[PDB]
Amino acid sequence: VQFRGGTTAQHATFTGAAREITVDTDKNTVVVHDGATAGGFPLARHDLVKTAFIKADKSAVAFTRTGNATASIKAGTIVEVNGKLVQFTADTAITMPALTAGTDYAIYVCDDGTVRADSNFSAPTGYTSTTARKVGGFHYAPGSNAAAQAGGNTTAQINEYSLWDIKFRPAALDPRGMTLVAGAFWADIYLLGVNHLTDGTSKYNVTIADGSASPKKSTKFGGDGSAAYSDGAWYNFAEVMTHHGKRLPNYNEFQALAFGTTEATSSGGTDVPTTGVNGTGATSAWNIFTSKWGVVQASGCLWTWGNEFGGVNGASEYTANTGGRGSVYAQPAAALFGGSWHYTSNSGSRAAYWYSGPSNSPANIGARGVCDHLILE
Amino acid sequence: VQFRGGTTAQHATFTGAAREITVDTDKNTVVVHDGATAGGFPLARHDLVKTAFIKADKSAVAFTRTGNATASIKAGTIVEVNGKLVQFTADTAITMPALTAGTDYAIYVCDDGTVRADSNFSAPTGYTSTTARKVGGFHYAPGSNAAAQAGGNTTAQINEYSLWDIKFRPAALDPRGMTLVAGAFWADIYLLGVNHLTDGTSKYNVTIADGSASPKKSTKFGGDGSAAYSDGAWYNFAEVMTHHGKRLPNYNEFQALAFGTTEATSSGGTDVPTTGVNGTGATSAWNIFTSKWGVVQASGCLWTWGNEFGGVNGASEYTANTGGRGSVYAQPAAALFGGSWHYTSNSGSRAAYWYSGPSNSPANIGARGVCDHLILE
Amino acid sequence: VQFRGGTTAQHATFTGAAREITVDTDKNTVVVHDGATAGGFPLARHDLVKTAFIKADKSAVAFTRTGNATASIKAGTIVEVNGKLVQFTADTAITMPALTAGTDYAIYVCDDGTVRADSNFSAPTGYTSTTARKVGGFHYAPGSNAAAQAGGNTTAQINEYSLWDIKFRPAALDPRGMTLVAGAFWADIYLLGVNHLTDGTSKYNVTIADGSASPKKSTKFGGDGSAAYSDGAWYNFAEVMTHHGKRLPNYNEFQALAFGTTEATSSGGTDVPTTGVNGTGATSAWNIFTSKWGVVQASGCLWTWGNEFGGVNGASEYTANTGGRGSVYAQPAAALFGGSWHYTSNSGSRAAYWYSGPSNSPANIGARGVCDHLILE
Ligand SMILES: [Mg+2]
Questions:
Q1: Is C72 found in the same domain as C34?
Q2: Residue B249 C-alpha to ligand 1 middle, in angstroms?
């Protein structure tokens, strides 16, 4: 059976009988008729709804944490994948792989109707990137989020605030290793590592970048992938955050992201070399410093450079201290937040130090990234 | 009549005659054929266009203010609601309820083809949240926006700049009580109130939060809903804004949002206890301080904490003044903007004071929230 | 042939045979049936996918620069235009007009299946705004982007980083004359001009706005389109950026956008009056100062006001120096970035000067705009 049809031009002056259907041969679609409206009512090609992703509540993430190792996709979620509609009319359990402390996972909605997580961010095992659509993810943390203001524990579990989907996520290109702070913005769970080019800025159990162990030079600003910065100046850490679509925190962001840590407490000992791990000679375990949002080593471990200036100024004369990129005049200090291991009761979620100019590079200053919260219709 | 059909796999090697239609039984959709293309041309299921919202001009809000108490939805607006297409081919009047000074309203497009406003943000009277879709809203202000730089009047009316829709709105979760400043960002119409947890940050005729009447403690940062902060330090006001997905203004934002106020003028008297209402012993009525964008008490009433640091510094020694969350060193002042009631000709849209550290808490400092402008395709 | 049909209510209790199609006369759409599901499966009206724009990689712009004067639209791009689906299954060449140095172009996908650029931002020649859909654009620069840290050349060509589309673009209303810096945010290619109301903030070969040649007064803040500001104070430049949905850069943004310029080098001579053109008596041609991202006169030409405060403070007393909009107390300096023509080896991508209060207005300070990167699903 071949239906009556014609071009779009031929349809423009044609009024079909009520409930008559024709085919527009220019568009390769069906046109429904009502006995009254010239041109009828063309229907949409599936191609024009490719990547559709519809949630019942667009103001919240698409998933719910249901236990330390379990999560569900929410009722009312509709997903286009591989030419098909896949929907969930009730909260539906996500099939989990083996979960390993300090690892990010991607959540996929597949064309067989299943929803599943995997450590692989291209495709889950058993599927391809065609039959399985990445719609979100989460961080399986090495310990709990802070229930109050005494840090968390060392029981590996899903961080509820690290749940993201394609329309509810970090603005930064790579959403991995980040957590949503009070619903307002995203923070890196871990302090910046030396090998951030391959690891991203936020990775568990890696060597922390600071004034002595400088980060690798950004490949967007002349770096070759191997060379590190000559030192850990503010300029270099800011440049690295920019590379990854992030920034250093301001004071309002820092107090928010670090809330839940054990206040007026520092790591002790002589160093904090590694993310998510006890410091060298530490008197407090790493988990003492976990925030409400699951930010790890949120205070009392390393200072983070901030994206704010103020406090004491440098000399009122042109000073070439920017790594060969011009001079500064009356340069104010760049903020440092959080305290570090040797600062005893001065560390905390509002600890702030404004004496150090941006060219300074001591062993107890590193960085933590933040970015905007991206919500989409 | 049952059409020829089969699975998606069976369709992959099938080329129907030109204008033949088949049914894909995996997808439950129609496939159109052209006599040439194997697989044909699948059509889209309605489920995959749920929540569609299309405007002729996505760079502007979907509505036009047509009078003090009237507004229309713009021509070319197409809305999916309850499985149906509802569109407007000309500017179409919004059915209004009784309008009450200092109240927010939601605009709904309903499946019977009507567009209507209501004080209820779940559903308009006569409808449910299924048959009526919330697409936007506005603030019915207690007075006019400033036509020049002498404030506004006390004639209750729709604030044109407070019009928002789901793809043209404050980035903050709750869009109510906000206005778009020069098309650039949104500002709270009213100064922060004590009861912001229930009222939101921007509400007419409520008790203003300041250094003596501290805001309720944020429930995202340890608050129980009843307890207030011990004082009105910068830290506490910043924390409240974060709770609501907002922030304190910087200097560029403040001069923009306050433009239109009566410059070099203060409220006078001894206090400004309440939003949108005359101050205690005031020599100027509240409306003298309305900005071009309808920001109420924009200057000369209470200072707002700003999200900027600079000016005079605190001691260059560790000082525990953050409410038990660590120490500050060489802490710069946090900006204050706008002036307050006792500052005579020093108040204005560019009034700025940089002597007060963030731990200060006097009766003449409160806060105003701002957030980004969210525009979506 | 008229198909069986009825209202949506009549459909609710109707289960058609498998592969039966009916027409919902309320919706004017087709409903597919499966012999089991009451109500069947309504299909989507084309109206509900109007403006659909789907890319294979939503994290990147839709176009690729293939030469100095050529570009293609990427494979997998699907576009709704004039009721039709237009797609590209391979990278497809964009038809170019004559290209003129320092000019912005719009890219259109047309309903005849072609993709083409034009200097006109309403419609390309030969088409209307109905048959041709603006989907993006680019800047044809007067010289190359910096390949290293020695600026660029004077060979006119497409700036790859200036490529934008409707879902990958400056957050500012007008995307023209901007470039994406390290994938993080957008910067104005050119310094702010006097005639920014008609030209936008970023235009080639126009008179630069500075402390002597003040910008035209913003028409959103009392300007009439002809009057200029009394001087070039920080306040005025910030106000102009706000008008255009932009802001002055902070330090982290500035070092990023200016990277690639010839460091520790200034224009020389006595002035830099014009964008994209040699300075008056310059010892370095304009192209010496082109950044990696194609930011023109990025350093060593004019200082830009920054959106940051710090450094040396003004008197600790109320000072009416805001153009009649209140007084400032202990006002910190507003940052200046980049250096200017007379600053020899002190200029560069990290050059910063913090001695000048915002009310200052010398001939060697202007402004450059930045804004957020807008990525959409
Ligand atoms: Mg500052």
A1: no
A2: 13
